[PDB]
A and B are shown apart, each in its own frame.
Chain A
Amino acid sequence: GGGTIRFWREKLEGYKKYHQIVKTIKMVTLAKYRQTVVRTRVRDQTLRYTRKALDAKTQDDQEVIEKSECLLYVPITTNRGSCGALNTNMVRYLQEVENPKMTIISVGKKALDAMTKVFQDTYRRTILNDMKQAMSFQFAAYVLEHMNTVPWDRAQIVYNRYHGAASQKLAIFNLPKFEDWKQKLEEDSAGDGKIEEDGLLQSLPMKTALGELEETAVEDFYNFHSCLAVLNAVSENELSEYAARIVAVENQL
């Protein structure tokens, strides 16, 4: 039985090569995680004022389907794997919240195939950003130029929030429609200023100062702050990709 020992030796040497390969993925991952952790120290400041405009009370999902006509979802997935349950939990969330009037323009290569195979017709396409350069405001603007093609009524951005090295959870931004956001702003600017949800900030002086603001500038205010929201989604999912991959690498080892 001189063959069985060669078969087992060959499997051993294969795994021995695979070990240094996964170790090379590990070190390459830490090379960009050390680069990207710097955002964590400079985190949670660029939307200190954006939320006061677009944030809302916890809306139900069964009501907006009846109010809306064509929803929209921006799930930000990844290009290459060994990440974890990120793309999987992001797919189980959409099928968990699936509904007839929806459409998905995602990001990342895994939402190319997974969404098309679990979501036959609702999914349309995706965007792919080669990670040779850090993301830019212009990339989020390219994402808004993709979203504007659809006459969407509410855009739910989904991404991965990095709370810590051992905490890469989900997170979302609920974006109303521009016309509907302006109607909510006009309806709110009249009545008395009262918060309808705990932890929600008052915004009446802002909604009136914006009420004086002309049309083109308010449209730039909306596309701007939605661009920052999208960009924060990308930077947070990028950090979550480089944060959970190391765990799904050391477990492979």
Chain B
Amino acid sequence: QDPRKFFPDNGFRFFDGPEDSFGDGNIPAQIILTLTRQDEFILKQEPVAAITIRTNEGEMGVLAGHEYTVQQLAPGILEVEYEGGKKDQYVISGGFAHVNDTGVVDINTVEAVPLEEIDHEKLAKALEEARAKSQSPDEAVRIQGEIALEIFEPLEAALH
């Protein structure tokens, strides 16, 4: 026989992840952010001044050279602040924030949409839909209503 004609490359090698070092110098002046929904990024290694996440334990904020950490993202909004004083908000659907001591952010999410493409009016009907689902006694619809309200209530308070 032929001695293993094929040799498929390990696909992980195609990506170029960081080498998170313990740090033998100073800290950078601005985080290098990289936001990714399902497969495609909306932001790739952009310099940014600050970022504010919403997590299950609570609401967090980050700057350059924040302590190394990794954690969930509550289904809600995400605030970002560039060095130019402006801001950028993104509605998200869960995810995992990956902050580094070098100063780097890799927020892998499922969905990421700007606020501009959302209307409070369409959210309004979905509120009472979620409330009716929660009040409808059924394990198949109750938790679906609790989750729908879990995602509308942050938007409900972010819009107002």
Chain A interfacial positions (CB closer than 8 Å to B): 38-39, 42, 44-52, 54-55, 58, 89, 92-93, 96, 136-137, 158-159, 161, 169-174, 199, 201-203, 205-206, 209-210, 213, 217, 220-221, 224-225, 228, 231-233, 235-236
Known: A42-B41, A48-B17, A92-B6. Contact between A232 and B11, CB under 8 A? yes
Q: In B1-29, which residues have CB < 8 Å from any A CB?
A: 4-6, 8-22
Chain B interfacial positions (CB closer than 8 Å to A): 4-6, 8-22, 34, 36-41, 44, 68-72, 96, 98, 100-101, 106, 108, 110
Known: A46-B108, A48-B16. Contact between A161 and B70, CB under 8 A? no
**A174 cross-chain contacts in B, Cβ below 8 A:** 10
Docked-complex contact B69 and A170, CB < 8 angstroms: no
Bound together, the chains give a CA A43 to CA B11 distance in angstroms of 13
Docked-complex contact A201 and B19, CB < 8 angstroms: yes
Q: Which of A54, A55, A92 has the most CB of B within 10 A?
A: A55
Q: Which residue of A lies closest to B56 (CB)?
A: A217
Closest 9 CB pairs of A and B: A170-B8, A51-B12, A171-B11, A49-B106, A42-B40, A46-B36, A55-B12, A45-B41, A52-B17
Q: Pick from B17, B20, B40: contact of A205, CB below 8 A.
A: B20
Q: Which residue of A lies closest to B13 (CB)?
A: A199
CB distance from B136 to the nearest CB of A (A): 24
Sampled A-B contacts (9; CB under 8 Å): A44-B14, A45-B36, A49-B18, A50-B12, A96-B6, A169-B8, A171-B14, A224-B108, A233-B11
Known: A54-B12, A205-B101. Contact between A136 and B38, CB under 8 A? yes
Docked-complex contact A47 and B15, CB < 8 angstroms: yes
Docked-complex contact B68 and A205, CB < 8 angstroms: yes
**B11 cross-chain contacts in A, Cβ below 8 A:** 159, 161, 171-173, 232-233, 236
Q: Which residue of B lies closest to A236 (CB)?
A: B11
Known: A39-B40, A50-B108. Contact between A172 and B34, CB under 8 A? no
**A203 cross-chain contacts in B, Cβ below 8 A:** 20
Q: Which residue of A lies closest to B102 (CB)?
A: A205
Q: Which residue of B lies closest to A232 (CB)?
A: B39
CB distance from B45 to the nearest CB of A (A): 8
